[PDB]
Each structure stands twice: as C-alpha cells, then as structure tokens.
Amino acid sequence: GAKRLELGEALALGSGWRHVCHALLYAPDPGMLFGRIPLRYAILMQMRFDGRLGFPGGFVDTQDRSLEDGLNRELREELGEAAAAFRVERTDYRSSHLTEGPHRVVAHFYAKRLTLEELLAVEAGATRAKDHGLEVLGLVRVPLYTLRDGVGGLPTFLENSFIGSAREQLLEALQDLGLL
Amino acid sequence: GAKRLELGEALALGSGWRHVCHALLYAPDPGMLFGRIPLRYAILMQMRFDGRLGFPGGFVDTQDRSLEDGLNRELREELGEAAAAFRVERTDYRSSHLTEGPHRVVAHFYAKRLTLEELLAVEAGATRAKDHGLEVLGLVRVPLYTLRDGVGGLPTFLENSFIGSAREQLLEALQDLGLL
Amino acid sequence: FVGLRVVAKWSSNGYFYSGKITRDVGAGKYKLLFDDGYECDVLGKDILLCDPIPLDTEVTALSEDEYFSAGVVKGHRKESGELYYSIEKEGQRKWYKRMAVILSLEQGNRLREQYGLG
Amino acid sequence: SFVGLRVVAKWSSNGYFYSGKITRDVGAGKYKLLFDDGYECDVLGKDILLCDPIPLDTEVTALSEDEYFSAGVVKGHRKESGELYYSIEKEGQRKWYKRMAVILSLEQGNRLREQYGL
C-alpha cells in the first residue's frame, strides 16, 4: 500500500519528489441526527475536481517557504478567507507517506482541532473561494455514525471515491485522535 | 434497474405507497477548469446523511396539495431560502420509478434549468438550511468533463455511492438535455 | 393459477410482496396484481405460490412509523377482507396486516424450492 | 556481488517499479536500494528486476512533466553524457524520456520477473 516515512526522511528526498499537504479540520459537534445518533465531531472533506473525496490541501510549490506555508496557502484557495482565522503548523503534523500513484509524490498529513464556530465559518464561505466550482466541487461532512442497517453512515461513506490513502488516513486519524 | 412506471400509473396506486420527489438543479456555466476544460453546466447534488450521493428532495405529505408542492417544500428545507427564488413544476417532471427499499415508495424525478446566479445563491446559503449538518452533509457539483487520463472527472464521480437509482437518473438527464 | 394468491418481487432482486395472479401470460410469464394496487408481469422464478406465508417463516415486517425489522411468523388470523400475521421478535409477538409482511431476497429464496413457480 | 548494479524495483508491495541501484546486500534476501530519485530503503529480491537498460519492445509507463503519464513501448536507447534516454513509442509516435521518467506498473514489471527478477 502507501509507505510511510519519518518527516526528516521525506525532507531529505530529492527534487524529483513533489510534496502535497492535506489537513484534517475537525471540531466538537454537540448536535445529533434524528435526536438519537451523536454527530460527535464535524469533519470537513472536499469533493475534488476529479470526482474524488479527500482532505483540504494541495501541492507545495518551490515558491512556498515551507510545507506549512504551502498548506495554509492551499487551504485559503480551497476554503476561503475564513481559513485565515487559524493556521496549521508543524505541531499539527501527523505523518508522511509516499503515494502509490505512478508519480513520485510524498504526502504530509496534518490534523488541526477547531471550534464548532470556526469549522462552520469555513463552510459558509467556501462558496466564494478561488477554487469553488473549479478545483473544489463542494465540501461535505464525514458521518462518524453507523445507521441501524449496519451499512449506512460511515461504512457507506467509505465506499465513495477517495484520493490516495484518504480513507486509511481518515480511519487512522479517527482512531489516533480517539474520536470514535 | 429500478422499475419505471408512468406518472398516472403512480398516482393511481393505493394508499400503501408513499411518494418521494427529488430534483436535479442545473445551470449553464461558461467557466473553464484550468482555462482549457469547459465546465458547460453546473449540476448540484448532495452528500446524504447515509454517506451516499443524491439529489435534493424528500417525502410528500398529506399537507402537500401536489407532488410539486411537496418537492418545493422539501427543497426549501434541504437547500435554504434561496430555493424560494424559483419553483419546480410539472413541466420539469422527468420520470417515476419504484424504489428498491423494503417499504412501498415511488420516486419522482425532476430536472429544472436555472440561471448560474440562482444556482450560486443555493450553494451560498446551503449552510443555513434546516437539514445542513444533519440530513444534508454538503453539496457538490457533478463534473461533466473527463480528464486527460480518461478516468478522472465524470467517470470517477459515477463511482461514488449513490442512493437508489440516482446515478441512472443522473445519466438519463445528461443525455436527454444534451448537458454532456 | 388465475385468482391464486402469491408473494412475488417486481425488481430484479427486491423484496417479495403479496398479490394475486391476474392472468397466465404463457411460457413462465405471469401478470400479477399486488395487494398494494401495482400491476406488472413477473417471471415464474420470481413468484412464490405460497399463501398464507407458513408458520415459522422468517419474514420482514413493516411498521407504520417507517421502521422495518425481521421476525418469525407464529400465527395466522383471518378476518373479513384481511389476513393478519403474528410475528415474533425477541420473544414478543405483534400483529401485522398482510401488506405489512414481505420477504427479503434471502427470506424468499428459501421458499423457491417448495413454492417457486420457476 | 549485486552491489552497484542497476535495477528496477518497487518499494511498495503492489506499487510501481522505479530505476535505481543496489547499494548493499544486507542479508535475509533483502537489498538496500538507492533509487535514482534519492529515496533509499531495503527491498526484497522479489521486488527487484535486474534489468538495465529496460529492453526494447518492453511495455513501460512514461511520465510527463505536470501529472500526466501513459503506457508506451521502448523503441530506442540513447546514452549521452553518461545519462540514459529511452525512446517510447505511443500511437505510432516516438518521444524521448529520461531514465527517471520511465517506470513499470505492477503488471508491466511482473512480466519480467522470470527473466530478470531476483
């Protein structure tokens, strides 16, 4: 599958490798579905222009001074000005992986905790971001519940089309973060 | 896959049958993805609470005077007040089908052409809708293009999880209306 | 076969619903009128000439509040113009109307060998 | 020994094969590879193709700048200034690619395990 590596090892990779950064923005969600299913946390994901689900983020250009500068830049173009109210940093860094695609790409995954108001703010403004209707087809929340039938909810949500290891990254982040 | 039946045939069914309505909202978009890929039309779908893609809509109740009345009511709940700027009518009706669900339900599919401004307003105010964060996890646009690799875009979008025969209703509407 | 009650499915692999054979379309083709009012032609292999659904059958019961669940038929009660099934679930039993008792793809396939018209 | 020899190997169980060199025999049937892209890790002999240059008429995956890639067939080798260049034919048209822009998919590389695998 997707091979992980220490951050430093990834930083040692040659110029032939491209870097992508993606952030897992999650907030405490006290609400409930139908008054009996806890929402637990609100987690945002993007439907990307290629019809796949993934976390907000993108490629790191040589202009960006660092992995984080690039991430926060991409997060602004994808989520709108409401993404400037916070900044993902090295402390939010989670893991690095070499993508299994044909090209040489190392993926750096971040997880940043926001407040329900902050997460709802980026939802309302994403429609006027530079990427809305182009690179980003829309934002969706991740259902962390499983419906009575046993398939509805997260299990079926995991049956959609995802970018790279977004499914495994999502589940690994949910267990690590302990949001389940 | 799901059995198609005529509108009259559906209206003559016994009280044991329930009726749901959903609408494909589309508008012309002269935008160009990457400056070389025509978007053509912007088609809205929604990530459902069960993790499946579908069109906005919902059940028709006894208070509803007609199928169209119940539809527009549900649209206002799922998409927000921007949906009150237009109305889906019988002229927008497309087809009827029997759903695969256990309960006896007949689904009525509609397609309405909007202006790109009317469609954006729906997206802009979708976060305030009653069902946002609960029944509607977010709206997405259907990519009508196919990327250079021949899999990205529409082909991969059609690989997501769809409720009922939404995928089939989608493809039928892309051809009949020449949207693709 | 005309006028005989059956339980049949109208989709390729949906639930079996209760109805009657209205006409013999010939060559394994049957026209059915379901108790819910829907008419369509169905193939013999998707028809279960089976009425009433026999005791100790695992069925799918429908409630008025959009819920549904599995259960076991433990009783039949005929009334003027309607049949009622006694469905047992988790030790308790509840009455259901005929139309409120259907069969999933799995539950009906168990009866094809004995009741199927394929 | 295999040290110093050029190879094509995948650092993932079901990934693509990338060009590189064996830097050391670290035992247990594992070989430390320095891929031409600067990545270095221990790879099993089963994931290493002792195959350099990639022979003519081999079906390969050619990488373009940006994010595009396509399947093609090797029709030429050119060594200018130590570096190796491949001529890839696609739809009756040939184009040049550097060594690092020529990789093998799991399938394309599996075809060569018998003749070149370790």
Upstream peptide bond of C52 is cis (omega within 30 degrees of 0): yes
| 3-state class (DSSP) for residue D111 | coil
Which tokens in the block code for residue C106?
Answer: 């799995």
Upstream peptide bond of A56 is cis (omega within 30 degrees of 0): no
For residue C67, give every residue at least 6 positions away whose Cβ sits within 8 Å of its Cβ, in sequence order, or none.
Answer: none
Q: Could A138 and B140 be called an inter-chain contact, meaning their C-beta atoms sit closer than 8 Å?
A: yes
Which of B17, B100, B106, B165 has the most C C-beta neighbours within 10 Å, making it the best mutation to test the interface with C? B100
How far apart CA D10 and CA D35 sit, in angstroms, is: 10
Instruction: Please check whether residue B145 is in contact with residue B33, taking contact to mean a CB–CB distance below 8 angstroms.
Output: yes
What is the layout of strands, in order, in the sheet containing C47-48? Answer: C39-43, C29-34, C17-24, C5-8, C47-48
How far apart CA A21 and CA A43 sit, in angstroms, is: 17
Which residues face B5 on adjacent strands? B96
Burial class (CB in 10 A: 0-12, 13-18, 19+), C118: exposed
Instruction: Please check whether residue A51 is in contact with residue B159, taking contact to mean a CB–CB distance below 8 angstroms.
Output: yes
Which tokens in the block code for residue A110?
Answer: 């971040």
Domains of chain D in start order, with CATH, are: 1-54 (2.30.30.140), 55-118 (2.30.30.30)
User: Within 10 A of C47 (CB to CB), how many other CB atoms are there?
Assistant: 25
Looking at chain D, after which residues does the C atom sit over 2.5 Å from the next written N, breaking the chain? Answer: none
Q: Could B148 and D68 be called an inter-chain contact, meaning their C-beta atoms sit closer than 8 Å?
A: yes
Q: What angle do CA B34, B37, B38 make, to 5 degrees?
A: 120
How far apart CA D25 and CA A100 sit, in angstroms, is: 25
| 3-state class (DSSP) for residue A127 | helix
Instruction: Please check whether residue A14 is in contact with residue A53, taking contact to mean a CB–CB distance below 8 angstroms.
Output: no
In terms of C-beta distances under 8 Å and separation of at least 24 residues, what long-range contacts does A100-103 make, across chains too? Answer: A100/A1, A100/A2, A100/A164, A100/A165, A100/D12, A100/D14, A100/D15, A100/D16, A101/A164, A102/D16, A102/D61, A102/D63, A102/D69, A102/D103, A102/D105, A103/A18, A103/D63, A103/D67, A103/D69
The fold of the A1-180 domain, in CATH, is Nucleoside Triphosphate Pyrophosphohydrolase (3.90.79)
Which residues face C79 on adjacent strands? C82
D69 chain-B contacts, CB cut-off 8 A: 149
Q: Could B156 and A50 be called an inter-chain contact, meaning their C-beta atoms sit closer than 8 Å?
A: yes
CA neighbor of C47 nearest in space, from C16, C87, C79, C92: C16
Please enumerate residues of D whose Cβ is less than 8 A from a Cβ of A.
Answer: 11-16, 18, 36-39, 41, 61, 63, 67, 69, 100, 103, 105
| 3-state class (DSSP) for residue D32 | strand
Q: Could B156 and A157 be called an inter-chain contact, meaning their C-beta atoms sit closer than 8 Å?
A: no
Tell me how the structure was determined. Answer: X-ray
- Is A57 labelled as part of a ligand binding site? yes
How far apart CA A50 and CA B149 sit, in angstroms, is: 10
Q: From D63, which residue of chain A is nearest by alpha-carbon distance?
A: A103
Q: So where are chain A's domains?
A: 1-180
Q: What is the resolution of this structure in A?
A: 2.5
Q: Could B14 and C14 be called an inter-chain contact, meaning their C-beta atoms sit closer than 8 Å?
A: no
Q: What's chain B's length in residues?
A: 180
C40 chain-B contacts, CB cut-off 8 A: 3
CA neighbor of B47 nearest in space, from B130, B128, B163, B129: B163
Q: What is the dihedral of CA B4, B7, B10, B11, to 10 degrees?
A: 170
What's the half-sphere exposure (Cβ side, CA atoms, 13 Å) at B104? Answer: 25
The amino acid at residue B69 is: D
